[PDB]
Design a protein around this ligand. Sequence first.
Ligand SMILES: Nc1ncnc2c1ncn2[C@@H]1O[C@H](COP(=O)(O)OP(=O)(O)O)[C@@H](O)[C@H]1O
Ligand SMILES: Nc1ncnc2c1ncn2[C@@H]1O[C@H](COP(=O)(O)OP(=O)(O)O)[C@@H](O)[C@H]1O
Ligand SMILES: Nc1ncnc2c1ncn2[C@@H]1O[C@H](COP(=O)(O)OP(=O)(O)O)[C@@H](O)[C@H]1O
Ligand SMILES: [Ca+2]
Ligand SMILES: [Ca+2]
Ligand SMILES: [Ca+2]
Lengths: 372, 372, 372
Amino acid sequence: ETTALVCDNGSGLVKAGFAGDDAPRAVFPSIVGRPRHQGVMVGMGQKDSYVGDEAQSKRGILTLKYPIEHGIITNWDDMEKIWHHTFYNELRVAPEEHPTLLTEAPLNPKANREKMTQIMFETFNVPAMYVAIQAVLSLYASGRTTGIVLDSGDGVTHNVPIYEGYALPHAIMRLDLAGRDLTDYLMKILTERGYSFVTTAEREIVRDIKEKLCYVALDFENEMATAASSSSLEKSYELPDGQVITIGNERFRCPETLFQPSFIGMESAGIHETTYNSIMKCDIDIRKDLYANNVMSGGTTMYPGIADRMQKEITALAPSTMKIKIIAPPERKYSVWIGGSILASLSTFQQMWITKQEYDEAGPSIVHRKCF
Amino acid sequence: ETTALVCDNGSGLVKAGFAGDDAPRAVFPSIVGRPRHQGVMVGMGQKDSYVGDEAQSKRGILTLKYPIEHGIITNWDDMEKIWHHTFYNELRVAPEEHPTLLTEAPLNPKANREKMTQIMFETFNVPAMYVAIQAVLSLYASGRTTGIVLDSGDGVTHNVPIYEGYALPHAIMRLDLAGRDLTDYLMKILTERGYSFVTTAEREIVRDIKEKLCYVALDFENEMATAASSSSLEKSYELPDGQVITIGNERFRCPETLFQPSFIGMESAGIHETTYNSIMKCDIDIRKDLYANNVMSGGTTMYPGIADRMQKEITALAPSTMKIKIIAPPERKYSVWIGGSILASLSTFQQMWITKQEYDEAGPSIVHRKCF
Amino acid sequence: ETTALVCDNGSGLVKAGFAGDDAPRAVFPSIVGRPRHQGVMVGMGQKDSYVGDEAQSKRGILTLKYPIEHGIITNWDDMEKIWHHTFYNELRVAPEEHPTLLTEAPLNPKANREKMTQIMFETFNVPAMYVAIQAVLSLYASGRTTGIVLDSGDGVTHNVPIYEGYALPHAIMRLDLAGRDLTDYLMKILTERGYSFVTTAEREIVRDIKEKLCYVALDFENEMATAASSSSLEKSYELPDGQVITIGNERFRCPETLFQPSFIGMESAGIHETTYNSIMKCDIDIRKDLYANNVMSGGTTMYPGIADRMQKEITALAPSTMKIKIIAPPERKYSVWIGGSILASLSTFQQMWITKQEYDEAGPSIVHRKCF
Ligand SMILES: Nc1ncnc2c1ncn2[C@@H]1O[C@H](COP(=O)(O)OP(=O)(O)O)[C@@H](O)[C@H]1O
Ligand SMILES: Nc1ncnc2c1ncn2[C@@H]1O[C@H](COP(=O)(O)OP(=O)(O)O)[C@@H](O)[C@H]1O
Ligand SMILES: Nc1ncnc2c1ncn2[C@@H]1O[C@H](COP(=O)(O)OP(=O)(O)O)[C@@H](O)[C@H]1O
Ligand SMILES: [Ca+2]
Ligand SMILES: [Ca+2]
Ligand SMILES: [Ca+2]
């Protein structure tokens, strides 16, 4: 009778909804706002803290804080506020009679998982729980049982190879370079044109202009020479005060940090070299099927032109005798949640739930034994 | 009315079919695979054991085990699994209404015979059964009655001389030097060029390299001087991860272990000297017929140039006044099956099966007094 | 009258000195460091590259490269620079009038060895050289002529059995599991407690943590049981910035990859099983001396409790009437150089030196015919 809830807790955006549906019921950015100015008006509905889209609407008078930093929950009171808002105010449901599925990045610290188990079996008193890896849900939504998944959120960019439903845990790659670092790099490179962006509302504006006006170059050097010589690549954006800015070559230097991490000073390899070493760390028999199935998910793969540059770099790195095809569906930023709608819908999954009873006589540590 | 099943149960491959047919139907290698990595995707028939060619298909995520090791059935549960697969899936017949002939190497322990008798009669409940020697079935398939048969499968190299149907049990020779050892030696010498192969999955790849690219040199020192002087003997192979390897003298260094077994530390004689010591251990007058009828059989005699080398070595070893002929049919790797199709079809053979009643009155020991 | 040099050029560290001495003079890790930021200060004695301890001290602004990867020399200009540094700058020795001795792990590919000849003769112009197997030098430093040597360096872990000075080439076992893989696995499991290490500069910090605080558990399951049920096993470590970390069960899980290599995903067996198969692949008589003369060498055998654990595992594997002794001297880290100094200063040794003239007619391929 009961229908399970699915809550994709990413790093910047939270997607919560019911199992079996095609699209998430509530998508809103996971932020907590607090007022940085004194209040002169008596009344006004002056809440001590703002959450969700309400904080995003009046961000000019709010200091905004992200409770998730690099896929790791730092502030927990903000997270119980986020989960209370998405349970009671958004979905308008009671958690006492609903199973609940969570998404977590691999190679995460363990105490995050026991505190996640602790802070919702005791407070919201759910009758079931499960925590799953995001890339497994990406293959569930993709409808195939084989491939290597590049998932890049706001904080974590991880590569997971899975062959015939059997994941290889030694081949799991994790990088801390994602869209927040791209936002910070876009803050850094806009100072040459003279536009100053320092505050968190300005960080939201930099995230919006990164969402609307960025793309990946197929080749960096020739398009840099084209932007230096010609005057066709620039575009205009309208700031919400009324000012208009013009951006030339910065709209393709920003995602290039994904392929060249030395721009922000990170020593580690690019995302193409990370994917190629993740394929190279796997066994020799399964690499042929892994070259033919490259699955993407997350909003950071929403830059136009990521697939062609990705295919060119993997085709350069791999030997030429292999065919390389990249699956990039246009609904992939909501991909992982749809896998949750695959996962709770199955009757085979219905006995591996962590109910209240095994949580009582084992403590939080049961989430290590059951989940993953 | 009932058709007898012929199941040549070799070390590497198994060949199952009906008696009277000219070729076996179910030919598949004798491996059992078990999962090695963590299973994450719920459902879709994740089996705990794969046997036969599907284990070859999924070998990148499976640890592989050979139940027969040099003609010794070690793990009997896997052997029962592969007999269940070759009865019920491949041939897809009821084993309780068909007689079953089985093959074995000579100088093999009696508990192997007793346990094959026990598993045939108690588990599958066959109505009749018989066990025969591989070299005798090779001489049946050769279509002659006098000769010395050298059969070298994947795990065993045996040599049996027969004159006018009367075998000579004192002159039967056995040697644990076959295709498994040749594969391991080729795995050892491939590291000199920098190619590394360690796992059991890529042992099949090294076996395929040995099948496709090796050959027997007529003169070893001249071929070594030719490989050292020039590069015409080099050949390339495509691994299934796209990497292209190339090998020079390693094509003919690997089968030379059959003629020079001191390369892997065994102080025993070569297979030509094994035949020469076999032919002098026979009686004084039957040697002339045995020299002209060197029947060759087995899968590891399919190398190019092995017959001319064997001709030169026996012609050097024997006194020069006789003809030495080596019978090498092009279908010789199935010959152990083919005479097994010959032997079960004879009307003079139908009285010497082991029935159910004889097993019930005499225990498993009936196969010692009846079979050979 | 001239003295020989002994330069153990292992995969992690270089240990160089004169023959006849009891201890090496120049011990430094095989590191080539290159700058990765921009240089803004004019002058300051800035160099294009760094080597040795000078690379180690300035590692915060450097990208570090190992030229040797699992025994195989990959980058040759870096290793030429390391040989130039250890000859001219460390030892203060002009190498045109001193012979040198070099070490190499067995089952290495041949193409290193001639190049290990070639730039030794064409660049530095040494009068003679010799290349030796490391386990032979370990048995020289042990002062006995009979035993099996487990040598585990930074890249290669190999077993070599030698009885009465006669090595058995077919029983030599190689396994690519050593201190770099242990460092990478420790770097993987340290993310469970929330400690992140991604750059190659802080890989040396993880190596120092592995050197100081790790130990081999005698029995694994009760050690995990008492690690979960108490906190006496936890130890604290000081990072050089000032931060303090605390490690618990990670102290003994990281040596356990030596005995349970399925943690990092390779299908192969542990070092005790590899030693046991190396003993059983030898001849039937000599095992009486091989069980009682286990010899350990290399820096990877420096963990506390490895000898008692290996004694318990070998005593489990061997039959109970066999006496098993493991020889673990406290100077076994430096034993390869000590045996090289013993061999180089030995009286009958000075006829198997590969001289300049013999290289001049024979080409680089003299090293296969003369050395080993
Ligand atoms: N249309 C778009 N184009 C480029 N980037 C986008 C787009 N939409 C979202 N993003 C980026 O994706 C990141 C978050 O995406 P997503 O993975 O869906 O959320 P989360 O990281 O919270 O799971 C944001 O930092 C944003 O910069
Ligand atoms: N064309 C070939 N070239 C070289 N070796 C071959 C060839 N075909 C088969 N073999 C070898 O024959 C061995 C097994 O052959 P066979 O005797 O038919 O199977 P079994 O030993 O199981 O009875 C294998 O190990 C394989 O290496
Ligand atoms: N005290 C110690 N405890 C544990 N491991 C050590 C210790 N000292 C060195 N090691 C390990 O030994 C490895 C290399 O040691 P060594 O064999 O001396 O150098 P090489 O492998 O270059 O010959 C290093 O990777 C290091 O992790
Ligand atoms: Ca996400
Ligand atoms: Ca055979
Ligand atoms: Ca060493």
